[PDB]
Amino acid sequence: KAPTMPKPQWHPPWKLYRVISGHLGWVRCIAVEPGNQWFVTGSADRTIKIWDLASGKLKLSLTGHISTVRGVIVSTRSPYLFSCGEDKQVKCWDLEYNKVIRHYHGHLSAVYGLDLHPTIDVLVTCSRDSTARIWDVRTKASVHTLSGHTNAVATVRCQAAEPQIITGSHDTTIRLWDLVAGKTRVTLTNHKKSVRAVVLHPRHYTFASGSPDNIKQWKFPDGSFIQNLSGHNAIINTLTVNSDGVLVSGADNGTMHLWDWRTGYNFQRVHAAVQPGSLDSESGIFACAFDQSESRLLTAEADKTIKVYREDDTATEETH
Amino acid sequence: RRWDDDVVFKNCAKGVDDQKKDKRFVNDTLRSEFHKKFMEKYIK
Amino acid sequence: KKYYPTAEEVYGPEVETIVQEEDTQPLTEPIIKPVK
């Protein structure tokens, strides 16, 4: 009865292969190197530690922040592992000497997330004081103050296709602030909850979006609501999408619901376990991003255990 | 030979009675190796 | 002595849960290019 019901997309279920637990505190960010060798992941212990992307062993430990590290954006166009700390300091720890090289400032409060633009030499630092900041890389100065949010700008997206910068505001209103002007070119007539999640699928479609309650898709030219999300009412914090058509949603309740970017039905919708030292209701996917080789999924939970989920071939998972 | 005759306890041969050391991390910060050493070294 | 549950049965026997503490490449291998 539903449109496009008997022809969904293909999505085999995944399986956890290794649960690395070396950090001391809730991991708030996780990122993979573009060479598929390093895995940068912060923690609540104010130490952004890099590990092996495939072996899983520890590779380095780089501290320096005065608060929780809630952002780690490894730059692919330049060797600089920039990080956003909650101590009002976007510590751009360059990996050329494993130390701070820039130490840019300007935000009045904690920084929510950071995203490096693929084309423009600037870093979109989504702060949480009242707005975001367009920090210029290798200049140590801000470009423009894109103040278009009534609350903290949690999510951030710097796409080369979208001319504006998609900012995710916690005031239940997403915005697309232009890079040259700075004003929000178009708002979002959706996401009734506090929107603190955003994704992008540039493989064969436009960039989507997300929300904790009543999430929906979008489009890159000026926004276009394609379809809403499934029955996921938990507080979503991680939203990753692969080029093969997989859509991973990481919520705070631990229910890592995996759906399709085209079909929309939840393929796996499995819930992860917790650490023995942790509490009963403490496991929650705060950050999740796929690998550079798009083989083993990586989700950093809140139970101080960076879990890695590999793939597995199966055929008895037909959805009605 | 014949140097330890009145020894009550012969040999313990067990430091932690489960392994040579802890070698296991836990999310509980109080019941970990960090708080066990900080309550034994700095405190007395 | 101590008393705590083991992590082998909680996270499953399949997923080899590793716990790395420290002492691996003290800011030399990802810092500079390796000696080719």
Question: How does this structure look, described?
Answer:
This is part of a larger assembly, with chains A (320 residues), B (44 residues) and C (36 residues). Chain A has 320 residues and is mainly β. Chain A has strands at 14-20, 30-32, 38-41, 47-52, 58-63, 69-74, 81-85, 92-94, 99-100, 111-116, 122-127, 133-136, 141-142, 153-157, 164-169, 175-178, 184-187, 236-241, 246-251, 255-260, 270-271, 285-289, 297-301, 306-311. In chain A, strand 19 (246-251) and strand 20 (255-260) form a beta hairpin. Chain A is globular. The N and C termini of chain A lie close together (11 Å). With 44 residues, chain B is largely without helices or strands. Chain B contains one helix and no strands. Chain B has one helix at residues 33-38. The longest helix of chain B has 6 residues, at 33-38. Chain B is elongated. Chain C has 36 residues and is largely without helices or strands. In chain C, 0% of the residues lie in helices and 0% in strands. Chain A binds chain C through residues 15-22, 38, 50-51, 56-62, 95-99, 273-277, 305, 307, and chain C through 4-7, 10-12, 14-22, 24-27, 29-32. Chain A: It is found in: Nucleus; Nucleus speckle. Chain A: The modification Phosphoserine is found at residues 21, 211. Chain A: Belongs to the WD repeat PRL1/PRL2 family.
* Beta-strand share of residues of chain B: under 5%
Note the run of SSEs of chain A as H and E.
Answer: EEEEEEEEEEEEEEEEEEEEEEEE
Strand line-up of the largest beta sheet of chain A = 1-24-23-22
What is the β-strand count of chain A? 24
The sequence of SSEs of chain B as H and E is H
What is the 3D form of chain A? globular
Count of DSSP-assigned helices of chain B: 1
Number of strands of chain B: 0
The residue fraction in helices of chain B comes out at: 10-25%
Helix/strand-derived class of chain A? mainly beta
How much of the sequence of chain A is in beta strands?
35-45%
- How would you classify the quaternary structure? part of a larger assembly
Give me the Rg of chain B, rounded: 17 Å
Estimated helix fraction of chain A: under 10%
- Overall spatial form of chain B: elongated
